[PDB]
């Protein structure tokens, strides 16, 4: 099966279905940053 490894910079969206709203949007460059 294909491997997807989220181990470098990625964008993230959190969506609500019924309204098609983007609740949150971001880019994770360094997941350990203060």
């Amino acid at each position: 099966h294909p491997i997807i490894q989220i181990d470098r910079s990625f964008m993230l969206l959190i969506l609500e279905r019924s309204t098609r709203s983007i609740l949150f949007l971001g880019k994770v460059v360094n997941p350990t940053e203060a």
Partner: protein, 337 residues
Amino acid sequence: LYKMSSINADFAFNLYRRFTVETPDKNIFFSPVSISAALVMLSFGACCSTQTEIVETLGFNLTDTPMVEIQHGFQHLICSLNFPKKELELQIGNALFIGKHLKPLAKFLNDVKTLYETEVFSTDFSNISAAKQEINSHVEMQTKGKVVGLIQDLKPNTIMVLVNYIHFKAQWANPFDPSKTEDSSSFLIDKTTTVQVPMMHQMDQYYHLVDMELNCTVLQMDYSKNALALFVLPKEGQMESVEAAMSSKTLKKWNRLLQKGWVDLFVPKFSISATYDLGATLLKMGIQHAYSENADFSGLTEDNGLKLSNAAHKAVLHIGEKGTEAAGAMFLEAIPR
């Protein structure tokens, strides 16, 4: 309808791109719906060019969607997002902290209370430090403890504060087994630098695709009800190009192309936080008269007695084996006009 959904998503991406310029090669995290909702609330009390600038900055064309339809749409959006759904915590609401000497219009207040999930608090801004603490504690409470210290500084002549808050907590449709999580796995933060993160791992059927035009992998992870996360993983060296392409059109394309199939998936467990001073950004984007001595908020107070002075946002995210918790809040500050 879904005319509004396309517009709000494109606003989110345009604002995102502004942040990629303001804070280049840094974590970004915000709630576009929180920012949009707060500004549209402010626009309810605005008139003429003050009002039109706000909704045009939010992405709306007043020929396509008349002011009253926009107002209606956003009222319906907030209602729908708050409608109780089993296994999903999602609340979005507003609070208006109004100076005790302001003369707000009954119409502005009764409307936001009844139609826009707004609590109204008469506030003594003669004690600015106490007011700042009250507002911060209210936001902290409404975000289940997650957004702390929203307001770092409050102008001494503040006479009104508008806040929007959002809190989201959901479980993955397919949670991760913590016994399969690697304690310390490499995550590339630049070409020659890795950090160590816990890396969750499961093999499951997920909706996914490789976008052949934009050279990125897209992975959808459902929450158990009414919500989903999308992870967008550009090919090495392609983040900027993917950021340029993000739009409502791109989301519509992916919605068609996503197919469910087996994936051996590795996802980090992590938390991040971000804050934004938005005053100058919103000015640059087209909200001008709201800040001026000729601001027209004649729908808000009897004497049109205020103008916008500052704006800020804070948002936080945690992702782990069970699901996701995220929260955000938007702050708009007003002073005597």
